[PDB]
Every structure is written in C-alpha cells, then in structure tokens.
C-alpha cells in the first residue's frame, strides 16, 4: 500500500516514444567531462578514466506530480560504485576518486545498486539498506530498475520487475530534481527510458 498515487496508471499507459525519451534523457550539457551522451539522451558512455567518479543529469527537472524512468545498467558494467537516484541542478558531477558520488552531499540522493545502501549527505559507512529487510550480500539488482519520483508526497523510491519497493527517501517537497546516476566503470553504458508523468 505504499505506492504513489497514479503509479499503476502511469506504468500501464503507452510508453513514451523515442522522442519523449530523448527530451527527458541524459543532458549532453549537464554531465561529467568524462561522460559522452549518445543517441540524443537515450544513454551515456563513461570514458575509461582511472581514479574518477562521474555523474550525469537528465535534461528535465521535476518539481510536481509523479515521474518515473527506467535505468538499464548492465551488471558487468557497474564496478565498485554504481549509484542511481536524483540530484538538484547544483550537485557535483565529478570527483577524483572512486566513491558513491551521488548521495555524498546535500544536493543528491542515491541507491547503491551493488551494496543496497541509501546515500544522502552520506560518505557510505553506516548507511541504511533498501528495500526493507534485505542486504547487499544477499541481493542482486537486475539490469533494469525503475526510479519513481513523487513530488506531491516528496519521495523517491524504486521498482524492480514491476513491483514498487517502497519510499527510499522522503522530505523532497519543494525541490527541483533531475534523474541522476554516478559511475566508475570504464566504458559503461547507462540507459535511461522515461516512462511518463501524472499530476
């Protein structure tokens, strides 16, 4: 019973076409210098750069209603720190070490899809596990996951295989938040597929 209002409606609507996906996809003008946005926003490729973590934001920031998008991040392309979430327009997108960049500061919120941990203003040790009752060593986030941002309640949560896993972060009302990830893997290809909005 934890779903945002209108999530089933949204996920059952005809999927946004490639045009819509590019409009709400990764921004070539808002990513790390070590990331190349391809296909007009449908995916990015992180260049091979040693001792760097690199982020990207979507083109569109959300302040109201419900928005969802699918991230596709091959399991073998995640490396030591693969973080999926949202950021304000001001979050840093690059740092010179391997780290959970997304969620390391005030401006970002991330789920570590290898460790299972949630980061916001967090360096990483002690961070809580998500979803409830799981732990890294005994879960595996598959290639595709949905990111679900409810800007009426002010929550960010995730869905896997069509199933919402609950609110991960709260307290987001009044912000303007963009899709975001941070990555460390040379030549990783991270795709984003916008699923639409309601509200």
């Amino acid at each position: 019973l934890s779903c945002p209002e209108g999530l089933e409606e949204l996920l059952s609507a005809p999927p946004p076409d490639l045009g819509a996906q590019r409009r709400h996809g990764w921004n070539p003008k808002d990513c790390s210098e070590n990331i190349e946005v391809k296909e007009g926003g449908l995916y990015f490729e992180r260049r091979p750069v040693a001792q760097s973590t690199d982020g990207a934001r979507g083109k569109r920031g959300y302040s109201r209603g419900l928005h969802a998008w699918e991230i596709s991040w091959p399991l073998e392309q995640r490396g030591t720190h693969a973080v999926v979430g949202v950021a304000t327009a001001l979050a840093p997108l690059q740092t010179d070490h391997y780290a959970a960049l997304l969620g390391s500061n005030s401006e970002s919120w991330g789920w570590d899809i290898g460790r299972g941990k949630l980061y916001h203003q967090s360096k990483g040790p002690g961070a809580p596990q998500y979803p409830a009752g799981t732990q890294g060593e005994q879960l595996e986030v598959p290639e595709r996951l949905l990111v679900v941002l409810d800007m009426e309640e002010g929550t960010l949560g995730y869905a896997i295989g069509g199933t919402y896993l609950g609110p991960a972060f709260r307290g987001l009302k009044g912000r303007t938040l963009y899709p975001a990830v941070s990555a460390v893997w040379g030549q990783c290809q991270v795709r984003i597929r916008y699923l639409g909005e309601r509200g």
Binding site: P48, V49, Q51, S52, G79, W185, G186
Partner: peptide, 8 residues
C-alpha cells in the same frame, strides 16, 4: 590495465 574499474 591493472585498474579495478576497467579504466586501464
């Protein structure tokens, strides 16, 4: 080459 994260 040699790096944990496929960077070289």
């Amino acid at each position: 080459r040699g790096d944990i994260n496929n960077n070289v």
